[PDB]
Write a protein that binds this ligand. Structure first.
Ligand SMILES: O=S(=O)(O)c1cccc2cccc(Nc3ccccc3)c12
Ligand SMILES: O=S(=O)(O)c1cccc2cccc(Nc3ccccc3)c12
Ligand SMILES: O=S(=O)(O)c1cccc2cccc(Nc3ccccc3)c12
Ligand SMILES: O=S(=O)(O)c1cccc2cccc(Nc3ccccc3)c12
Ligand SMILES: O=S(=O)(O)c1cccc2cccc(Nc3ccccc3)c12
Length: 152
């Protein structure tokens, strides 16, 4: 089953700085800022579309990973589209979740435009708990980096 959500939020950080921290320096900063995430390793490609990253994390003493695949990336338009799937750490009811993110200038800061598509196994509805967990983690990473950028 396919479940789509669209959201907008704002940041006081201007788009080039926010894009650089979250997308270009994200693989270095995320493990430093999020206790559970141990590493983000490129397993295929060189940072362009098709690049696959292995994200390893620890929870309740156990180690697992998921795969992050770049669908599109363009620095000039602050565009970053990526898919989370597979590995040993992914939500059981999900085949994949695809993200389309875009920043634009707003009021000295950034407007953030997101489109999120959950692909559930078979014809399963998206449980509230799975929506909530993917959203909290997505927000957590983005907002940990944003706070870091504000501190510097
Ligand atoms: O929980 S997931 O829904 O995959 C998830 C969804 C959205 C963003 C995520 C970012 C990093 C790690 C995740 N999970 C993860 C879990 C265990 C080990 C490694 C990564 C993320
Ligand atoms: O949502 S339901 O209407 O039961 C449902 C309806 C139709 C197909 C479903 C397939 C898998 C899991 C479900 N439920 C489920 C229940 C608890 C937790 C996670 C998924 C499905
Ligand atoms: O939560 S939001 O404020 O849009 C948000 C804020 C900042 C960064 C985000 C990155 C990915 C998805 C989001 N939203 C999202 C929406 C539904 C499900 C999962 C994530 C992000
Ligand atoms: O902790 S929980 O709400 O369970 C939580 C569980 C899973 C993912 C989370 C992502 C961001 C923030 C949380 N809360 C949080 C609460 C206090 C300080 C920092 C983060 C998340
Ligand atoms: O991760 S902390 O452990 O604080 C940390 C530890 C050691 C050095 C740090 C340098 C800059 C920012 C941090 N964190 C940070 C995160 C969000 C907002 C402001 C600062 C640093």
């Amino acid at each position: 089953g396919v479940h789509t959500f669209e959201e907008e939020s704002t940041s006081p950080v201007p788009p080039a700085k926010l894009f650089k921290a979250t997308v270009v320096d994200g693989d270095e900063l995320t493990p430093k800022l999020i206790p559970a995430i141990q590493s983000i390793e490129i397993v295929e490609g060189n940072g362009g579309p098709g690049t696959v990253k292995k994200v390893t994390a620890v929870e309740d003493g156990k180690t697992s990973y998921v795969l992050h695949k770049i669908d599109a990336i363009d620095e000039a338009t602050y565009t970053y589209d990526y898919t989370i799937s597979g590995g040993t750490g992914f939500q059981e009811i999900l085949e994949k979740v695809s993200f389309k993110t875009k920043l634009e200038a707003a009021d000295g800061g950034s407007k953030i435009k997101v489109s999120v598509t959950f692909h559930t196994k078979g014809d399963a509805p998206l449980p509230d708990e799975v929506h909530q967990d993917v959203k909290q983690k997505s927000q957590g990473i983005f907002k940990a980096i944003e706070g870091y950028v504000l501190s510097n």
